[PDB]
């Protein structure tokens, strides 16, 4: 938009946001494998 480093940054923001769905999925699956260890 303003810059062609501000057009490369609208797509970097998406990646940053995604990094937020890969941090909640790794802390979930380690919290779910300890709950399946008490059930095994």
């Amino acid at each position: 938009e303003q810059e062609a480093h501000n057009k490369a940054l609208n797509q970097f923001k998406r990646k940053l946001l995604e990094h937020r769905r890969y941090d909640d999925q790794l802390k979930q699956r380690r919290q779910n494998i300890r709950d399946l260890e008490k059930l095994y």
Binding site: H5, A8, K15, D23, L26, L36
Partner: protein, 61 residues
């Protein structure tokens, strides 16, 4: 504009390693879930009828 271009190139390598770690826990959590089913189908056969009925003298622990 030099800090946000090196910041953005830190989320390309950081998200590439976090996808590899999460693919290992997906394959692993399918192997564990079949160990709980395994035990339980055995446990389902003994649980159903018929079974004697008795009372607890003591729990000695």
């Amino acid at each position: 504009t030099q800090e946000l271009q090196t910041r953005a190139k830190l989320l390309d390598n950081e998200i590439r390693i976090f996808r590899s770690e999460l693919q290992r826990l997906s394959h692993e959590n399918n192997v564990m879930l079949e160990k709980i089913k395994d035990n339980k189908e055995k446990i389902k056969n003994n649980r159903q009828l018929p079974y004697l009925v008795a009372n607890v003298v003591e729990v000695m622990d």
